[PDB]
């Protein structure tokens, strides 16, 4: 078979790689902010749980782990 | 001595768990007809059963009797009998211990032990 369908994907992937290259710095700031919102949503979801259970403060010796930050 | 309301007056199933005190979680299966294919498949249900003596082990076939009054929200049956014990089956036809499709004790013999 011909490679025509592969050529379409070849151009799509090439053009996408250069688009990511152009806006690489913008994408980095988008991600750090999407992860920060991802963390706040995680923290709030944990606060909802204990408040609904009837606790007025989080369980003793508990600190929500920061799981989306540059910990590794 | 009125009997239970529940439809399942007698249910057979396998003991899939025994981590609750004096209770055995049992999985029963029934055959339900697929209307499109007109073939029977297995619909399985979970039944909590009162195991008074904690004499049940995971994997054994058991017979449950519907309790007249529900003991709790989910415990509405008791353990009538253990049809097959896991690994300790006794052949109904001959009465001799078996281990799969074989006799641990020959039916010709009469050990009476």
């Amino acid at each position: 078979k011909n490679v025509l369908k592969i050529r379409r994907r070849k151009m799509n992937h090439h053009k996408y790689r250069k688009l990511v290259k152009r806006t690489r710095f913008l994408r980095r700031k988008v991600r750090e902010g999407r992860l920060k919102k991802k963390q706040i949503k995680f923290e709030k979801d944990l606060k909802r749980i204990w408040l609904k259970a009837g606790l007025k403060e989080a369980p003793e010796n508990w600190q929500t782990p920061k799981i989306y930050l540059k910990n590794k | 001595i009125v009997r239970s309301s529940v439809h399942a007056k007698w249910v057979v199933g396998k003991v899939i768990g025994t981590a609750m005190i004096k209770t055995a979680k049992v999985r029963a299966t029934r055959l339900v007809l697929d209307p499109y294919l007109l073939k029977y498949f297995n619909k399985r249900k979970t039944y909590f059963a009162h195991d008074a003596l904690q004499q049940c082990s995971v994997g054994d076939i058991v017979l449950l009797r519907a309790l007249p009054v529900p003991r709790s929200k989910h415990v509405k049956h008791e353990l009538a009998e253990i049809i097959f014990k896991v690994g300790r089956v006794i052949d109904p036809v001959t009465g001799k211990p078996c281990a799969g499709t074989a006799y641990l004790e020959s039916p010709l013999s009469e050990p009476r032990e």
Binding site: - | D34, Y36, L37, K39, F41
Partner: protein, 108 residues
Amino acid sequence: ATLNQMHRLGPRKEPPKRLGPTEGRPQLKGVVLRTFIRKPKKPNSANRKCCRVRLSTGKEAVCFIPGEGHTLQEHHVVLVEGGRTQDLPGVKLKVVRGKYDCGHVQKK
């Protein structure tokens, strides 16, 4: 698929029928906003008479005006219907001749 696989999935999942320019309604009433010409994609050649309208739903759409010659102007009221103009891409509505301000084509 095997009978066990057909049983676990059942009948084919059916994508919902998304609505069109009229929002699944026989007709809509709109007020003309502008009258302009659209060019039929190649290989056709014409100066097709179209107009923008604000429909009762509140959105704005481009509507082809059929017939030889229309008197439509801004602020006029028209009854739009479905039916795409094949040569005109994006024009999914048509005006009904003989209703509200739009009138029947003057016969020659």
